[PDB]
Amino acid sequence: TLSLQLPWVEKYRPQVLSDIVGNKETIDRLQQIAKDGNMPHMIISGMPGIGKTTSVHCLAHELLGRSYADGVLELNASDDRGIDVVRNQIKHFAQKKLHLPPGKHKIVILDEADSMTAGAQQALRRTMELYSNSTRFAFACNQSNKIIEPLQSRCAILRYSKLSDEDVLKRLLQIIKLEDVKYTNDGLEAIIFTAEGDMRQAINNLQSTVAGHGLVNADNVFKIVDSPHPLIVKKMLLASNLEDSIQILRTDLWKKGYSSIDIVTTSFRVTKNLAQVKESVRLEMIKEIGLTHMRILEGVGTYLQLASMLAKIHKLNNKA
Amino acid sequence: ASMLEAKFEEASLFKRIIDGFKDCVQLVNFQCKEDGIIAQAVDDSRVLLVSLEIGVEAFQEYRCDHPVTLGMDLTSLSKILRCGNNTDTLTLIADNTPDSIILLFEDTKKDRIAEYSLKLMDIDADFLKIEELQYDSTLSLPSSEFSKIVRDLSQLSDSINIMITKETIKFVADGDIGSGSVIIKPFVDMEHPETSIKLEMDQPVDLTFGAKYLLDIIKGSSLSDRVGIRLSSEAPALFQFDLKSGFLQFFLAPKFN
Amino acid sequence: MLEAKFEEASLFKRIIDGFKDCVQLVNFQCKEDGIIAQAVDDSRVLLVSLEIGVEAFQEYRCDHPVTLGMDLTSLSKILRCGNNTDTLTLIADNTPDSIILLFEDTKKDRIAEYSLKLMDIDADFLKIEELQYDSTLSLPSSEFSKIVRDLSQLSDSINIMITKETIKFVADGDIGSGSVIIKPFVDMEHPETSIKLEMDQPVDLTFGAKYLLDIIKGSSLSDRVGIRLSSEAPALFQFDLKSGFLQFFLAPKFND
Amino acid sequence: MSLWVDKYRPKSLNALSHNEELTNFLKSLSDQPRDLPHLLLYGPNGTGKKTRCMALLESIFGPGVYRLKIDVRQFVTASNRKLELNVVSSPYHLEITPSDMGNNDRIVIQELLKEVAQMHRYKCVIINEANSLTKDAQAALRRTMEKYSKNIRLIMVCDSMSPIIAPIKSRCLLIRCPAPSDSEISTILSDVVTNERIQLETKDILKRIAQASNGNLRVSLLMLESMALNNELALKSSSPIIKPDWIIVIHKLTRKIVKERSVNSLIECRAVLYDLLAHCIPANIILKELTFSLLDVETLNTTNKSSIIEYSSVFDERLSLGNKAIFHLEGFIAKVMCCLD
Amino acid sequence: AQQPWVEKYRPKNLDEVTAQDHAVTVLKKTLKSANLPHMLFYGPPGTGKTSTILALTKELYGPDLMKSRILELNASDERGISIVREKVKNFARLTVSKPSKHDLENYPCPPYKIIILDEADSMTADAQSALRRTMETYSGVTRFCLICNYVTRIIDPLASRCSKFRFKALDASNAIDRLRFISEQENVKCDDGVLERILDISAGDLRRGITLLQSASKGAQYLGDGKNITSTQVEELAGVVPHDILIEIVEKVKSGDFDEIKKYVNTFMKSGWSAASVVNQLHEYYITNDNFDTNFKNQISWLLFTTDSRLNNGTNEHIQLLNLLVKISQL
Amino acid sequence: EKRSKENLPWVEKYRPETLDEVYGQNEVITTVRKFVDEGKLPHLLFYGPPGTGKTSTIVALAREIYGKNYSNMVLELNASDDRGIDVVRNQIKDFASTRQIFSKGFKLIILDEADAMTNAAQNALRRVIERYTKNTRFCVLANYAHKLTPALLSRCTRFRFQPLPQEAIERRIANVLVHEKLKLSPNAEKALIELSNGDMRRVLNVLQSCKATLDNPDEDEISDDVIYECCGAPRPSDLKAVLKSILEDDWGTAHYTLNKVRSAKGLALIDLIEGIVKILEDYELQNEETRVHLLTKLADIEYSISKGGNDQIQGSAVIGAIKASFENET
DNA sequence: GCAGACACTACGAGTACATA
DNA sequence: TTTATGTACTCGTAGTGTCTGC
Ligand SMILES: Nc1ncnc2c1ncn2[C@@H]1O[C@H](COP(=O)(O)OP(=O)(O)OP(O)(O)=S)[C@@H](O)[C@H]1O
Ligand SMILES: Nc1ncnc2c1ncn2[C@@H]1O[C@H](COP(=O)(O)OP(=O)(O)OP(O)(O)=S)[C@@H](O)[C@H]1O
Ligand SMILES: Nc1ncnc2c1ncn2[C@@H]1O[C@H](COP(=O)(O)OP(=O)(O)OP(O)(O)=S)[C@@H](O)[C@H]1O
Ligand SMILES: Nc1ncnc2c1ncn2[C@@H]1O[C@H](COP(=O)(O)OP(=O)(O)O)[C@@H](O)[C@H]1O
Ligand SMILES: [Mg+2]
Ligand SMILES: [Mg+2]
Ligand SMILES: [Mg+2]
């Protein structure tokens, strides 16, 4: 068993703030914090895979250098971050006396901060308020709703947005030029379409296509990784002909190996996130999709139930 | 009458042997043979491996013509050993490929007789031929000293790093409270031969281990007066506790990076 | 009219410790011959009988027959002051709605008096149908509790197969099986550990687990416990006492 | 006790002057009780099903079934919630009801039936109001009576058949209890009053009670006792037919719905419904009474009546699958107001 | 005569199951071999799944090994996720018991033990998901037999792993030999078409037929006239509506007049018949008639189906019956 | 296990022991083989319907990478094992952090049916995967994707296991018949293809039960007739006759025909409903209202049958629904 | 050595969340 | 605030064990 090569997701992880693409204003603000040194408490939020925790790690590396071994305390969901056994850890770390450069402070990376309990954040409130001169915190959560409002009242809100296609394409081309793999622009746009602004997904699909076919042409890309089924569901629900919707359902989901419950949940999510049709029509569509969802969850999962769901969706859509 | 008979001199020996590695292992696979009884068992995390072996000299009487694979459960085994007077003479009894074994908790030497039985467990995992190899180092320190050092260092960090270089043993454990650096210089004493820090040297080793697993190792220090540790960069750590007629190893897997 | 003065404070407490888990409450019936308090469990299976003599437990003065029904939790809470020297005093006047439990200590002059509430039960049935038992067994109670807890930990069903010269205890469970056999052995030097099983007819009855635990909980009542078994009849677990005895009954459930 | 409903109850099948065919069938079962299967008596409430059960019980073993006692049993559930439910036990039988909270009566059934099955060969287990079981204790019962049957027997009493699942219907013998005829109601009331000391001008009062009771003998006896107490132990031919205050509230609600069909009247309807649900009333019977009182209003049309009954069926289906009955009842009243307007 | 006729005549051999010939032959030929797959018995109640599995276990091991190599669970037993994760897993991973010389010589003892999960459709999906890999991993030592009367409650992976044996409903043609045998053994005087009526009323089950036969025989014994049990006594004891009352219901429905049908439904429900039986009688009367138009039959079939489903939900049957009759009356 | 093979069901006897023995998923198998030969193995996520060969593929993969004793070098966790967040914090963390105990290789963690893990467990597993990915690879087998955290989905390479096509089932059946000394008629093979519905375990179970069905295991060939009695599925000719009687014949004839077909060999209304659904999907219907009415009414009927009820009323409902739906078309 | 003192692991009851 | 399992967290308590001491 030979030692595995490090995956391109981790091999080409950025180590400096310049390499992170997307959200130019946020990255420039982070760079100005980096050279300025006056890091405030911040909470970083966004959709997964767009570069949240890597910016935190890069900023922690840049602000303080050889002190990175002991000047930063990183915590995560794998560590049992509770109210009692962990309040002492941050209390000691903030109370720990370590000599920094004049404009640098200790960093407490509470990575994946949306999973902590309420009491832990309640203690962290005064923990942050007391030793603000010595230590600074860095929350990195997918969802900022779990963080209580006292924590939001003393933090710098840094909202990341989903990456534009141009930035993903730019960093992808950088990766190709460092790896020297033959590429076609159609294949690259296929990767961009499949990723949906999720960068790690783009890198993983690039890995699979490169190591599966050598060439990243569009046919090989669509052979290896399938198109995202939310788009297929949205296409199916928006069709005007019932026969067309049924054919799309069967061919693209039932013959491709998709569970009925997955189709129902994706249809519910697409309907609630859809905006072209009238609001009320979306309300009855959601009600019918939920009725079919109850039928599926109660035990009867069949192509017939999905076909009936589509038939009634067309009944509401075509206005009787 | 029964094919497999193993009458211990005292139930205390088997109780101590079972309680030595009861905590760190859930499923045990005994393999009785004419040369003795062995037990190769793996932890749930598949990091710590226990290789019990009891020689024929630790049994007052022993006889087992056909090899027997006794896959068992240590929780229920210890529960069975929990009941019964410790002075009593245990006699392990099993049939030809049976569904259970019989624990003769013969009280004193007469009167009360117990027939506790534990249903045999189907463990299809074969024994692992991890005996030994060319180990880089071979040290030997008293069990009490090692247990005290491990217990002291476990409170300071979650990882204990054992370093051997130029006839010197060094334990370091950097953590949040502090960083212990307990060091030992090898020596030998004729006055008290039990306390002697023996050592061998081929190549320096710097291997780190978890704290909870090392505590699990030192829980078994009551069995042996001496513990022998052998380390290598391309081998799991070996902790050979010497018994009255056999031994009890502890193949611990070091961390990487 | 009731003057059930008890010699030791931590003696009636020792009795109610056994009484606590066998039944939730008892209906006391005090008579000059003795104190009887029998109660029926929630399952109508386990029967508890109480008998307290008059020679010991200080002077007993039961001028009139008094029937009282009360809980044991509050009684234990009041009896928590159970010093080794303290005594007890039971006083029941006309309409004894609140019994005053006087504590007087010989070693110290400190006094303690508490009142116990009385609930309206007025229900007590006393019937002892069977006295003849095929097998009568006396053995130390601590060993009985030990063997019962060891067999009940392994299995939820306990059966006894009494044969010639063997008092066989067997417990079959999913984890395994425990078949502990004890022989009748009497040492004149150690009366407590003496074991005699009188033999008229072999008895094979299958019992439960929680009932056996409740029975063995009151192991400290007697050094030697009288175990009586009768075929096709309720069991009798009689615990001796310095004045009287406490017997426990159980139905031998059997579905084969 | 002084109540006449529980003072004159036929102890034996010989005193069951109610149904000749049903009494003969029960006597046929009691002829050879060595192989009596599990029973399930169904019919309108107030018919006297429990009377037949007790009469059959004393015909199987003998006199002494009618002596009863109370034995509270402590039962523990998930977490440490205490829902100690008493059992009305007795020699030779055992009477249980699912008066405990419906979400966790399954444990009551499981451990109590397992406890009674630890051993005159069988002890009958009567389960009053079996239609209130929540399809979970019935699952336990499926194997409970099937596995242990030579030691335990069930007389499963319920006033409705629909909530009982198919296997329970399959493994239990079905016995039908029709409601009394009006002539039989009058005969029973006449026997009661001649054993009592109430003076009657004419037996037309008994017939009026029979008509108003709608085949329910229990409420018939209750109303006769109330009238006799109110009429100074001498019934009057002009005495108004007294109705339960619940019926009065339902009829006033129906009148308010019929006359005023605005949102505000729906607010007072909601308040009245809140009071009625606070007054220990099941949702099925209140919706049934509201529906049948609405259909009895003469100002309605046949189309409105059909719409009302169809939405009543729909919302009764909703009640059978819902938790908070107030929302379903308010929705039914809203639909009725929409149809009538 | 200490047991009811349902359990007194419960089959004790695999050949005694006089229905489901395919499943019984498959299980017998498997009994000759040792390749017993993870079974999944399903079908209507009373078709004989529990009897079949008990007979199969008894013929496989014998009376001695029932207590050692059989683990039966119910909804009466606690069947949470913890029970599936610990009790079932432990019993599966234990080795098989030791067969004796007598059992091995007389019975074809296989080297596996069967775990029977009766009424398994009541378990939560999480427990079944936990049971999946327990079923898969220890296939060489234990067999799982899932006995549920609803397939849809069983999740897809278990239906994939388990071999499915549908238990067909027992109509008049399939299960007339069993009833004739029971009548011969019990000496029950019978008419010519009485057993056909019993099997017709007992919709797809034999337990109900046996219970009805026992009740009719007990009634005939009480009367003691030595008279053959007619179809009338069985029809009355079965709880089905007599034809006169059904004709009256149809006559009231045909004329309309909501007040009249409401009054008659009130009186009918006062007499207290089971509404499911009334719906069944109305279905077998209206559909089989030839005096009604095609469109009427379509609409009345849909109405009867909707009423039957609503009744099966467990609702108040009075309102459902009145609604069905009024909807039919306006056709 | 006991008595080696020949005492196991055909489901667990014919389990692939090599990546070459997995049929159908040619692309996935070839990509995985290329991955392991080139030395790179990212975090794999196998998604697909039941019976498509996910756990068989990953077991064959672990056997190929490691030695014969793959279970000694792989921490394989399933829903039977407790997988709380404490398990992730202790067992997974210790297995990922430490070095291999039997040889020199990367740790491999296989999480079969990982969709049953809680949200907090997946949240911890996120950072556990991302931190110790240098010498530890995670494989996640999930039938359902909606139960997986999107963070977990964005971390593992997604491989989709399609339902088995005709050729793969035919090849496996040919291998099984070659091994078992069994003969089977091609029409029976086509019936098996239609009955499988993309599942392989169904095929193996039906073959086992049909071999058990035959009086003489040798000599006699398995025809589609034996398949149809052994599985109990309706024959296509029966479905065609029932549908024709419903469409053209009147109520007496259609009801009598459906009852006779059901009572001939004990058919159930279920499997017959979706047989009729397949046949009607094989039709062209001018009016969309016919399709709408058919789908809605048949779904309601199938739901009611799933909840159980009276079979006669449900059959009458099926006939009425079909006949009312094929009259709005004209 | 027996007694107290000591801090440790183990156990039980209570609360709060459950889709983005 | 009822809901009704399963999960996870937190605290509190009861013993159980080895460690100092006279
Ligand atoms: N803007 C970016 N520029 C370059 N690489 C990026 C960028 N965003 C993400 N990546 C890549 O994404 C991988 C890791 O992304 P992460 O920042 O760890 O994901 P994340 O933002 O933390 O989302 P979650 O919530 O943790 S799953 C590495 O391979 C990075 O190279
Ligand atoms: N094929 C059959 N042959 C003979 N008797 C049968 C048959 N099927 C059912 N029975 C009778 O049905 C009774 C018990 O059947 P069961 O096996 O309990 O039905 P079931 O499969 O358990 O239905 P459930 O569990 O309620 S879904 C006994 O009286 C049997 O004699
Ligand atoms: N492609 C295939 N080639 C050959 N046999 C297959 C194939 N797919 C499935 N099988 C068979 O199906 C049996 C069970 O399927 P598994 O692959 O073990 O489980 P699975 O397909 O992952 O389904 P789940 O999701 O785990 S329930 C295996 O033992 C094989 O005999
Ligand atoms: N044959 C009868 N003669 C006189 N009264 C009867 C008869 N049968 C029943 N009853 C009356 O029925 C009442 C009991 O009804 P009950 O069994 O409670 O009905 P339900 O079971 O529907 O609640 C008793 O008060 C009794 O007077
Ligand atoms: Mg991150
Ligand atoms: Mg059954
Ligand atoms: Mg799998």
Residue numbers in the entry:
A (entry chain B): 4 to 323
B (entry chain G): -1 to 255
C (entry chain F): 1 to 256
D (entry chain E): 1 to 119, 133 to 354
E (entry chain D): 23 to 353
F (entry chain C): 6 to 335
From the primary publication:
The eukaryotic clamp loader is Replication Factor C (RFC), composed of Rfc1-5, belonging to a large family of proteins involved in diverse cellular activities, referred to as the AAA+ (ATPases Associated with various cellular Activities) family. RFC uses ATP to assemble PCNA onto primed sites for replicative DNA polymerases δ and ε. The RFC pentamer forms a central chamber that binds 3′ ss/ds DNA junctions to load PCNA onto DNA during replication. We show here five structures that identify a second DNA binding site in RFC that binds a 5′ duplex.
We assembled the loading complexes in vitro by directly mixing the purified proteins with a double-tailed primer/template DNA with both 3′-recessed and 5′-recessed ends in the presence of 0.5 mM slowly hydrolysable ATP analog ATPγS. In the open PCNA structure, Rfc1 and Rfc5 each bind one different PCNA protomer, holding the two protomers 14 Å apart in-plane and 13 Å apart out-of-plane. Because the 14 Å gap in PCNA is narrower than the 20 Å width of a dsDNA, and 3′-DNA1 is already inside the RFC central chamber, this is likely a post-entry intermediate in which the DNA gate has partially closed. These open and closed PCNA states resemble the open and closed clamp states observed in the T4 phage clamp-clamp loader complex and the recent RFC−PCNA−DNA structure. In all five structures, the Rfc1 AAA+ module sits above the PCNA protomer (when PCNA is present) at the right side of the DNA entry gate (viewing down from the C-terminal collar), while the Rfc5 AAA+ module is above the PCNA protomer at the left side of the DNA entry gate. The same 5′-DNA2-binding groove is formed in the RFC–3′-DNA1–PCNA (closed ring) and RFC–3′-DNA1–PCNA (cracked open ring) structure. The RFC interaction with 3′-DNA1 is similar in all five captured structures.
